[PDB]
Amino acid sequence: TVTKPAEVPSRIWTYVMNADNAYGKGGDFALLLSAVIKKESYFGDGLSGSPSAGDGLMQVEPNTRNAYLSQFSAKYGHAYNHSSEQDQVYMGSLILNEKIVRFGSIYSGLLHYNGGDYWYPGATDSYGRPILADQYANTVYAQYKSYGGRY
Ligand SMILES: CC(=O)N[C@@H]1[C@@H](O)[C@H](O[C@@H]2O[C@H](CO)[C@@H](O)[C@H](O)[C@H]2NC(C)=O)[C@@H](CO)O[C@H]1O
Ligand SMILES: CC(=O)N[C@@H]1[C@@H](O)[C@H](O[C@@H]2O[C@H](CO)[C@@H](O)[C@H](O)[C@H]2NC(C)=O)[C@@H](CO)O[C@H]1O
């Protein structure tokens, strides 16, 4: 059985569970999306001061959001609204789920979520920061496991 980790705030859990339902994941994707958002934005409390603050809860970069708009709209029935927190989480979900499916694993989905499909040790993000996509996937997967992930 799955349950909200006590550290995850109510409003976030609602958002990821809605994402989880849109994928039929039995509550398990919700746990992985919780781990992702904690690392990415600290639920929103870890955004301010960073140059990528404006990219929201799952930290999807502007050019990445642009690439997935029509896909977002098909999956969820409305045009992506970056001001909607629920949409931000819906957008990160769709992309993460697309990588997990495409590459065949959670770990690999996580690595290429943070680094893109062509990440190499040393590559930089849209802000020019180093992307440590291996470390990201290790510690996000550990987190997902602690929260009860089964897969
Ligand atoms: C030292 C440390 O742990 N800093 C954390 C940051 O890693 C985290 O930043 C987010 O990191 C992702 C890479 O791990 C980025 O893709 C994402 O853009 C970035 N978020 C921001 C707002 O810059 C922040 C956010 O919670 O928390 C620290 O724990
Ligand atoms: C969650 C997130 O936004 N991850 C970012 C990656 O998408 C991103 O990758 C780059 O994204 C574009 C997606 O349309 C591609 O045009 C581009 O080719 C791709 N780069 C690579 C190396 O695959 C990276 C880098 O900007 O940042 C992540 O945060």
Domains of the chain by range and CATH? 1-151 (1.10.530.10)
> What ligand 1 atom has the least distance to the C-alpha of 53?
22
Per-residue b/e over 76-111, b at no fewer than 16 CB within 10 Å?
beeebeeeebbbbbbbbbbbbbbbbeebeebbebbb
- For residue 78, report the distance from its CA to the centre of ligand 2, in Å: 23
Token pair for 3? 């349950």
Taking the centre of ligand 2 as the mean of its atom positions, its distance from the CA of residue 6, in whole angstroms, is 32
Identify the three-state secondary structure at position 62: helix
Write b or e for each residue in 139-151: b if 16 or more Cβ atoms lie within 10 A of its Cβ, otherwise e.
ebbebbeebebee
Could you give the CA distance from residue 120 to residue 126 in angstroms, rounded to a whole number?
15
Phi (first) and psi of residue 130, to 5 degrees: -65, 145
Question: What DSSP character marks residue 8?
Answer: S
Å from CA of 60 to ligand 2 middle: 9
3-state secondary structure of 101: helix
